[PDB]
Amino acid sequence: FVGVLSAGINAASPNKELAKEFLENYLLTDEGLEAVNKDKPLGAVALKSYEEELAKDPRIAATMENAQKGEIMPNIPQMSAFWYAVRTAVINAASGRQTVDEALKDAQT
Amino acid sequence: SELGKELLEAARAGQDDEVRILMARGAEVNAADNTGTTPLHLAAYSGHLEIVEVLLKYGAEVNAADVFGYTPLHLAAYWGHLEIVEVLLKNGADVNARDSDGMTPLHLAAKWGHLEIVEVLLRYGADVEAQDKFGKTPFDLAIDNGNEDIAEVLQALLAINRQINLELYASYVYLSMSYYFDRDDVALKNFAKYFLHQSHEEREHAEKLMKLQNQRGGAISLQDIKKPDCDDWESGLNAMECALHLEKNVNQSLLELHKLATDCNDPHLCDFIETHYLNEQVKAIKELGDHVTNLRKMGAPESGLAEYLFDKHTLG
Amino acid sequence: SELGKELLEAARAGQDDEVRILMARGAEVNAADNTGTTPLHLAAYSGHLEIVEVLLKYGAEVNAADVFGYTPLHLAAYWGHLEIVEVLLKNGADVNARDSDGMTPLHLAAKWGHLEIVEVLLRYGADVEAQDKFGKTPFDLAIDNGNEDIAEVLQALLAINRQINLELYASYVYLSMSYYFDRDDVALKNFAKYFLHQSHEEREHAEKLMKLQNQRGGAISLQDIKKPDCDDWESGLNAMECALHLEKNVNQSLLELHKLATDCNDPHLCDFIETHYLNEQVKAIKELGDHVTNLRKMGAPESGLAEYLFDKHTLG
């Protein structure tokens, strides 16, 4: 699961261009991600050049390759039932109460 | 299970002192968890023989299946622990136990390449021809994983058992032939005498192969003997031709057995075959072809005078 | 079929002169109507042997099935014509032909009470155990219609064939037992020698029953010989107890055979059984019970010294 920390602008904002300038020319650049990473890092980031700066850490390279070959997290509420359905699937799998197909088609519906 | 999980922790960890004290307190030995895993299962998976021994001393179940079908023998064969395999078989473990996949412990030991486990399992009667859900025998799992010596053992054993069954089959065909020739409408006594002699010779051939298999330490495994193709042969000529066809089939299977023995680097088996079997087949085929050509030249089957006189002069 | 219906009318009516002239003109013999009825079918249904003979001389089909499955042998067996049944069997008529109902000609001849047809059919290998769509054997059709002598013949034949198969079975169990006792981990030579002797004696018993069946004019019919129950016996005591159980089973089936022979008024079979079989069974059961009690008193199986010394002193 690719979990992406993003910066959403409020939809009631009359401050569109100011925050867009702050996000594009200051945040999502080399020095902005550098300044935030001096206190707490962000791992794999979205900006390409700063990914080339951080790719000397092999943890960051492993994170970005798993992220680019991974599945993006769904933005939909049915995902909640997913976390209620398929979890029970492995509770029927590793415990052996059901088989593979039984647990997975129980998580299907 | 007031001390059952106290047995589970020692079975996971391997403390003979802990289980000795728990048996001093009378801890229950059949403590099954939610998935069926017993203290004997963990004792087998771990590979400490002492906890297994004392668990069997207090009467633990040797054939307890989990929710996946595995017994302690399955897990013991997977991880390659010889002594616990031996003592499980010594306490009445079922050697042909199937899991959810239908895989016997022999499947596992052939898939992973443990020779001594395979041999001890073969000693106790493991089925060579058991197939799993994919239709794989242990021979197939041994060739797919590069365990060539296991596959050699498994192939030679099956081939010798099939030759034993084939010699037992041929004796019964000759019995049928012999008692056809003394029906009151087929009154040929020397034909019947000849075929009874052949029946007893083939019984001796099969017994020789059984004795050889016992000298090598292999496992004899007997099958059904199927009934002959006819109850009614038709003449002396037709029965002689069927007997020739039969002995040629037997000779061909013996040649395949010899080639298999030569691939497996077994000079003793090769010399046994070519000393007791390969020259007798040649003699028998020569004699039966002699009988067929003489009977055809005399004018049989459509001459009843020919078979009477062949009965008197050649078989007499 | 320019002369085919001209053959049908003579087959319905029975004129040897008409069919002689039609064969002088070369009339076709395989004239099938819309329902498959051949001139041979009507020749059989009518019961004139000469037209059947000349139809087979010109190559009529002996196994021509109609739309209901009947052959000329079926109709011949229904109406009770012995000579045409004989010459159809002489020309290669299939004796186990099934109709639409699965009823063989033996079913018909047993249902209607024709003895000589039943006997000629049994001589050529008719199946005693053939079932029709209702699951009825010819024995059932003979008891349902009051043909008690047919049912007697059919019952005695089946019983003697089953006794032959049972004697062949017991010889193979003893062979298994014998070669268990010379494995290198079961090193008891005199046990093995004893059980090989028993194997050959049972082979002789079966051959005696086969010779008796040939003297009476009955039909030997062989079946499969099934594999013994174990490959691994466990001790000398356990094998002796299994052998005792086996010989008791054989004795019980012999007593049932004797009672059946007494119902059928067959003094020769009764005297044969009680002269060659009933006293040997008593001797064998006495000896095997002797062996079992001595082995139990010496302390076997849990004393390995007991079986060694029994091997030396009793079987030596």
* B164 near C CB under 8 A: no
Cross-strand partners of C225: B225
Structure token pair of residue C153? 């013949």
Q: Which amino acid is at A31?
A: E
Contact B226 C231 (CB under 8 A): no
- Is some CB atom of chain B closer than 8 A to the CB atom of C127? no
In chain A, residues with a C-beta closer than 8 Å to the C-beta of B36 are: 96
Report the gap between the CA of B141 and the closest CA in chain C (Å).
Answer: 26
* Identity at C148, one-letter amino acid code: E
Tokens encoding B187: 């009154």
> Cα–Cα distance between C97 and A90 in angstroms, integer?
61
Q: Exposed, middle or buried by CB within 10 Å (0-12, 13-18, 19+), for B154?
A: buried
User: Is residue C122 within 8 Å of C220, Cβ to Cβ?
Assistant: no
3-state secondary structure of A4: coil
Whether the CB-CB separation of A88 and A106 falls below 8 Å is answered with yes
Compute the radius of gyration of chain C from its Cα atoms.
28
C5-29 burial, b for 16+ CB within 10 Å, e for fewer? Answer: ebbbebbeeebeebbeebbeeebeb
Question: Chain B: which residues have CB within 8 Å of chain A?
Answer: 34-36, 66-68
Residue A15, CA distances (Å) to A27, C67, C107, C122 in order: 16, 96, 103, 109
| Class of residue B244 by CB neighbours under 10 A (exposed 0-12, middle 13-18, buried 19+) | middle
Q: List, in order, residues 6 or more apart from B254 with CB less than 8 Å away.
A: B163, B273, B277, B278, B281
Do residues B242 and B250 touch, judged by C-beta distance below 8 A? no
Q: How many CB atoms lie within 10 A of CB C239?
A: 25
Q: C-alpha dihedral over A40, A44, A46, A51, to 10 degrees? A: 100
Nearest-angstrom CA–CA distance, C130 and C137: 6
Token pair of B135 as six digits = 């239709």
Return the residues preceding each gap in chain B, C–N over 2.5 A, or none: none
Residues in B touching C214 (Cβ below 8 Å): 179, 182-184
Contact assignment for C222 to B227 by CB distance below 8 Å: yes
The four Cα atoms C140, C144, C146, C150 give a dihedral, to 10 degrees, of -10
Residue type, position A77, single letter: P
Residue B115: both structure tokens together: 């020779």
Which burial class, exposed, middle or buried, applies to C311 when counting CB atoms under 10 A from its CB (0-12, 13-18, 19+)?
A: buried
How many helices, marked H, and strands, marked E, lie in chain C? Answer: 15, 0
Can you list the alpha helix ranges (DSSP code H) found in C68-125? 72-79, 82-90, 105-112, 115-123
The widest CA-to-CA distance across chain A, in whole angstroms, is 57
- Residue A47: what residue type? L
CA distance C134 to chain B (A): 27
DSSP state of B290: H
Chain C residues with CB under 8 Å of B125 CB are: 231-232
Q: Which residues of A touch B67 (CB under 8 A)?
A: 95-97
Q: For residue B249, how many C-alpha atoms fall within 13 Å in the half-sphere facing its CB?
A: 11
Residue A94: closest C-alpha in chain B: B35
Q: What is the DSSP letter of A27?
A: I
Binding residues of B: 167, 202, 205, 247, 281
Q: How far apart are CA B292 and CA B285, in angstroms?
A: 11
Q: Is the preceding peptide bond at B138 cis, omega within 30 degrees of 0?
A: no
How much of chain C is in helix, strand and coil states, percent to nearest 5? Answer: 65, 0, 35
Interface A-B: count of C-beta contacts within 8 A: 9
Chain C contacts of B160, Cβ < 8 Å? none
At how many Å resolution was this determined? Answer: 3.0
Percent of residues in chain A assigned helix, strand, coil, to nearest 5: 60, 0, 40
Using CB atoms, which chains have 3+ pairs under 8 A with A?
B
Interface of B with C in 187-226 (CB under 8 A): 203, 207, 210-211, 214-215, 217, 219-226
Contacting residues of B for A96, CB less than 8 Å apart: 35-36, 66-68
Asked if chain A contacts chain B via 3 or more Cβ pairs within 8 Å, the reply is: yes
> Which pair of structure tokens corresponds to residue B161?
């058992």
Closest CB from B179, B224, B226 relative to C214: B179
Helix (H) or strand (E) holding C301, with range, is none
Calculate Rg over the CA atoms of chain A: 20
Cα–Cα distance, C132 to C101 (Å, whole number): 6
Nearest Cα to Cα of residue C43 among C8, C74, C18: C8
Please tell me whether C205 is known to bind a ligand: yes
Q: Is B162 exposed, middle or buried (0-12, 13-18, 19+ CB in 10 A)?
A: middle
CA atoms within 13 A on the CB side of C135: 0
Interface residues of A toward B, Cβ cutoff 8 Å, are 95-97
Q: What angle do CA B62, B67, B68 make, to 5 degrees?
A: 90
Could you give the count of Cα atoms lying within 13 Å of C184 in the half-sphere of its Cβ? 9
Please name the method used to determine this structure: cryo-EM
Residue C183's SS3 state is: coil
Q: How far apart are CA B161 and CA B218, in angstroms?
A: 10
Whether chain C lies against chain A with 3 or more Cβ pairs closer than 8 A is no
Is there a contact between C231 and B221 if contact means CB atoms under 8 Å apart?
Answer: yes
When scoring B183, B193, B195, B205 by the number of chain C Cβ atoms within 10 A, the one with the most, hence best to mutate, is B183
Provide the H-helix boundaries in C114-147: 115-123, 138-144
Direct distance between the N- and C-terminal alpha carbons of chain A, in angstroms, rounded to an integer: 22
**Beta-carbon count within 10 A of B26 CB:** 9
Asked if C210's CB is within 8 angstroms of B228's CB, the reply is no
H helix count then E strand count, chain B: 15, 0
Give every CB contact of residue A97 below 8 A, 6+ residues apart in sequence. A91, B67
- Looking at residue A26, what DSSP letter applies? I
* Residue C167, marked binder: yes
Q: What CA–CA distance (Å, rounded) separates C225 from C205? A: 15
d(CA C53, CA C60): 10
Helix, strand, coil shares, percent, chain B, to 5: 65, 0, 35
Residues C184, B214: C-beta atoms closer than 8 Å: yes
